[PDB]
Amino acid sequence: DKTVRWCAVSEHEATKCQSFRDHMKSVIPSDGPSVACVKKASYLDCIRAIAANEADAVTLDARLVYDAYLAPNNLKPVVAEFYGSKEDPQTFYYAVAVVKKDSGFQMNQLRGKKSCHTGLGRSAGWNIPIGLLYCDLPEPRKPLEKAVANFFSGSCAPCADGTDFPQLCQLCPGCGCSTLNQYFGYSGAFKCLKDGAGDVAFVEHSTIFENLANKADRDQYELLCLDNTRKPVDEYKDCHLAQVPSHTVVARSMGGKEDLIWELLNQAQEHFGKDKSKEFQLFSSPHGKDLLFKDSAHGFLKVPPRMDAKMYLGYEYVTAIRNLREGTC
Ligand SMILES: [Fe+3]
């Protein structure tokens, strides 16, 4: 079944990718799928490499999955992570806004606060919250990056251009687009909040549970609800900004090895999936969180035949894309 060239973003994912490679070769038959690792500096380098036939797969946030579908890359979603549990696999998660208890501000009072984002262009960390805050932003609202920079009093938006928008990297100079940046991703945006650099962290409902084991510590955090009220972090079901599609593995439309990618990940989850093995874990790592796949993931599900990004994401989500692209207030 040959090799799947997985695109790892930076050293931490590269390390996990190597371990993945070795453990698979230890339990998979000689004629079964194998994993090779291609190291890049950002998810964007991964998209291009795949489009260039230099790599075959990379897992992306749903909003980035849409971007990957755009010319000249034209990539397609092939395997989706799922969450929740084995009994009720959910191919979605919730975008939430975590804040410190007693900080004294609601969703409608975010102007002038310091913000922590998982990364520019990602569902929970950017597009969802910024979409809801769009009209509260000072004009001109486009380019978005500049408007967001002016709205907050400094933030960290990984992957954004610090030269054009320095305010977006005040909390994480350079705005690194990988785990090399301590405030990158879900875990990074949360740390940015926990360590006191920012007042709010736009992440997923699972983020605080994935990063803080003690309930006593979690009781010092809250969530900002749409009706301008706050609720405990465990009440995300009825206090979130939006429900968003799973992070998903993308590949080329033609000659993309979608068949081998599924086989690799399906066999991988049977051997090293959630709580499957003590020797290696697909959804965790001593080198960092959310490497290659989200830690909050419980497994994988195959995307229907030839489905493109638009079909996969669903009507609601694509509408919100058009809505943001065509601002209006
Ligand atoms: Fe995400």
Side-chain angles (χ1 to χ4, degrees):
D1 289 295
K2 263 67 273 283
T3 312
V4 172
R5 295 169 299 176
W6 203 280
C7 194
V9 177
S10 280
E11 5 302 309
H12 300 148
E13 292 202 339
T15 297
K16 182 174 180 175
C17 185
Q18 175 59 55
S19 292
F20 179 30
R21 184 202 78 153
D22 291 328
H23 284 287
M24 281 303 271
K25 296 200 291 177
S26 81
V27 307
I28 302 300
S30 297
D31 354 44
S34 52
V35 212
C37 308
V38 177
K39 184 170 70 178
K40 291 299 178 172
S42 73
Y43 76 92
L44 194 51
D45 288 326
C46 280
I47 287 172
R48 304 191 188 103
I50 298 181
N53 193 27
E54 318 281 49
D56 304 307
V58 70
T59 315
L60 300 171
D61 169 75
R63 184 63 184 68
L64 300 178
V65 168
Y66 178 75
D67 282 347
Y69 137 80
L70 299 177
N73 297 129
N74 325 114
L75 302 189
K76 282 186 174 182
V78 295
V79 182
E81 301 178 342
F82 75 74
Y83 318 92
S85 61
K86 310 132 71 70
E87 300 64 39
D88 180 32
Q90 302 171 180
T91 48
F92 62 80
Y93 53 99
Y94 303 96
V96 297
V98 191
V99 295
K100 280 215 181 72
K101 177 170 291 176
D102 290 304
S103 62
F105 65 89
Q106 302 292 171
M107 196 61 221
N108 65 330
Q109 302 172 294
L110 279 170
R111 175 181 266 89
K113 299 297 177 301
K114 280 171 176 52
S115 61
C116 309
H117 311 266
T118 58
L120 180 70
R122 294 175 54 164
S123 295
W126 187 266
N127 297 258
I128 294 308
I130 299 306
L132 285 175
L133 294 168
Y134 184 81
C135 301
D136 300 327
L137 280 38
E139 293 204 54
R141 298 185 177 111
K142 183 183 183 302
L144 253 71
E145 294 76 25
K146 174 66 86 168
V148 170
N150 292 323
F151 185 72
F152 293 115
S153 53
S155 29
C156 172
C159 317
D161 165 35
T163 298
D164 278 69
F165 323 111
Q167 306 66 43
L168 290 186
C169 318
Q170 185 175 312
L171 270 39
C172 59
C175 275
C177 200
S178 77
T179 62
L180 295 183
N181 169 5
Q182 61 181 16
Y183 295 169
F184 171 78
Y186 296 116
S187 59
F190 184 77
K191 175 180 178 62
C192 169
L193 173 69
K194 173 174 160 60
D195 289 359
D199 302 301
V200 63
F202 295 106
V203 294
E204 62 161 354
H205 67 289
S206 302
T207 303
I208 193 165
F209 301 101
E210 212 63 53
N211 294 280
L212 273 184
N214 309 276
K215 192 186 186 303
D217 297 323
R218 296 196 297 288
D219 289 339
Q220 293 310 112
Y221 297 74
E222 303 185 298
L223 299 175
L224 302 180
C225 322
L226 294 162
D227 60 358
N228 303 302
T229 66
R230 290 185 175 198
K231 278 191 177 190
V233 293
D234 49 83
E235 286 179 53
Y236 56 81
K237 188 66 63 163
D238 308 303
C239 178
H240 58 265
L241 312 190
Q243 189 192 86
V244 294
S246 309
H247 273 202
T248 84
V249 183
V250 298
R252 287 177 298 282
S253 187
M254 185 190 296
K257 300 178 182 176
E258 64 278 354
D259 67 311
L260 302 176
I261 292 168
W262 168 240
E263 185 170 57
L264 169 76
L265 300 181
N266 191 35
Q267 291 183 181
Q269 76 180 319
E270 190 166 357
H271 285 82
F272 311 109
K274 259 299 209 284
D275 306 303
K276 281 294 187 178
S277 168
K278 281 185 275 63
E279 291 189 85
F280 182 67
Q281 299 76 51
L282 268 49
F283 309 116
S284 77
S285 172
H287 306 297
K289 295 192 181 298
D290 306 320
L291 307 183
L292 299 186
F293 309 109
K294 286 173 65 175
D295 272 27
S296 60
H298 276 64
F300 305 120
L301 278 169
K302 194 176 186 179
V303 174
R306 308 185 299 288
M307 195 169 282
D308 54 45
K310 310 189 302 293
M311 288 180 248
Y312 172 66
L313 297 175
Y315 194 81
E316 300 292 291
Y317 199 77
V318 179
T319 299
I321 300 298
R322 303 198 199 69
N323 279 161
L324 191 289
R325 289 280 155 288
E326 320 179 309
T328 307
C329 299

